[PDB]
Structures are given as C-alpha cells and as structure tokens.
C-alpha cells in the first residue's frame with residue numbers, strides 16, 4: 001500500500017490568502033449605490049461646470065441608455081435654440097435650472113446599472129428593487145458611459161472589462177450609436193463621434209463591490225484629463241489599487257458631507 005496524503009483539519013486553508021485579500025478589499029471600498037453616486041456628481045459639477053449631474057434614480061440600463069442619451073441631446077439642442085424640451089425631467093431640479101444645466105453642459109455622465117439575468121428595462125428595475133431590499137449586490141454591476149459632447153467622444157468604462165459583452169461587441173454597438181448621434185447632434189465641421197473602450201483589462205480585481213467607486217474615480221480622472229492614461233498607470237497589486245481608491249472615496253464622502261441632499265447645484 002501507499003501512504004495516504006495528509007488532509008488538514010482546516011476546511012478552508014487553501015483559500016485563506018485569496019479570502020483574506022478579498023475581505024481586505026471589500027472593507028476598503030464598499031458598494032456605492034445610486035444616491036451617493038448622485039451626490040458625488042453634484043459635487044463634481046461644482047468643480048467642473050461642464051458636467052451635468054444626471055440623476056441615477058432610476059439609472060439607465062443596457063436596454064435604454066441610448067434612448068436616454070438621445071432625449072438629453074435633443075433637449076440640449078432645443079434649449080440652445082429657445083425651444084421646448086420633450087425629454088423626461090429630473091425630480092431634484094427645477095425645470096428652469098435643468099434648462100440652464102442643458103445649456104451649459106459639455107459632458108454627460110451616464111451610469112448604467114446592469115444584471116446578467118433581466119432581459120427588459122422593467123425586469124432590470126425589479127431586480128434592482130429585490131437586491132436593495134435584501135441588502136445584496138449579487139451579480140449586479142455599475143457601468144459608465146461618458147458622452148463628451150465637446151470632443152464628440154463616447155467613453156465606455158467597465159471595471160470588470162467584459163462583464164456585459166466582449167469589448168469588440170460593445171465597440172460595434174457604440175459605433176453604430178455614434179453615427180446615429182452624428183445625425184441627432186450634428187457637428188458644424190462634420191467631425192464624427194468616436195468611441196473609446198476604456199479598460200483593456202479587469203480593473204477591480206479582487207472586489208465584488210467597488211464598481212460604483214471605480215466609475216466615479218475614472219470619471220474624475222477623465223475630468224482632470226480627457227486623454228487620461230490613468231488605467232495604465234495603476235499599481236499591479238489589487239489591494240494597493242483599492243487602498244488608493246479608498247483614499248478617493250474618503251475624500252469624496254467628506255466633500256459631500258455638508259452639501260445639500262436631493263437637489264441640483266445651480267448651473
């Protein structure tokens with residue numbers, strides 16, 4: 001016979017290292033939901049007046065984000081010509097202040113909430129409600145589509161790289177959308193909307209909860225520099241990545257602490 005291998009009396013020991021790293025990471029950067037994201041955007045507007053703090057309640061989804069962007073751009077086009085707006089209105093903003101934001105904006109920060117299971121807008125909202133009630137993130141995810149109007153650039157940011165679909169499939173969908181926007185919101189010089197898929201690799205490695213904060217951090221990097229290469233200059237170590245992100249979150253949460261709730265800043 002052969003000597004049986006030793007089986008340790010510790011069920012989970014083989015995973016300790018990975019479990020420990022994840023626990024540390026989840027603790028450093030917990031989930032950012034719709035409400036704190038909105039506050040952060042309001043705050044970002046005070047720093048960068050070009051950013052319109054679009055409401056995240058309810059957020060866009062993969063089923064309606066294009067229609068949502070088109071409604072907004074059509075309304076901005078209308079405001080600039082003294083025409084009436086036709087799109088759905090914000091709940092925390094007066095109609096007049098909203099028109100002022102539309103006139104002034106050069107950048108739409110479009111957060112999209114996503115879950116693999118729902119197959120309609122309505123079912124996505126239902127899934128969102130169930131998860132909120134049980135206090136669970138689950139397989140849900142935040143994505144950011146930046147509509148840079150001034151540069152005519154659509155920037156898609158997935159901190160999980162390919163959670164919704166392969167990057168080339170999203171590139172295709174967004175490239176078709178970009179040519180639609182060329183007709184909807186035409187440029188004088190005929191410059192075409194271009195598309196950027198921001199992440200070449202998984203950004204939030206080791207976390208199931210840091211997506212919201214990652215979206216906001218990338219947005220802030222983009223606001224600092226619309227050609228930011230920050231994603232390429234990240235620490236290789238995932239814990240270190242989230243340590244820096246934790247510093248961002250802390251700074252943001254401090255900055256909005258005494259800012260007014262449920263109301264847009266003046267344009």
Ligand SMILES: *SCCNC(=O)CCNC(=O)[C@H](O)C(C)(C)COP(=O)(O)OP(=O)(O)OC[C@H]1O[C@@H](n2cnc3c(N)ncnc32)[C@H](O)[C@@H]1OP(=O)(O)O
Nearest residue numbers: 117127130131136137138139140141207208209210211212
């Ligand atoms: S910032 C967020 C970034 N997102 C990610 O990183 C995604 C990473 N993937 C995961 O975290 C995994 O999906 C794991 C760890 C397995 C999460 O577990 P689940 O796959 O079970 O998560 P679910 O979304 O499937 O749901 C979990 C709980 O929520 C309930 N639930 C409600 N509603 C739905 C719908 N419409 N589809 C699935 N589940 C759903 C479930 O009953 C479940 O309840 P629990 O009591 O928490 O098990």
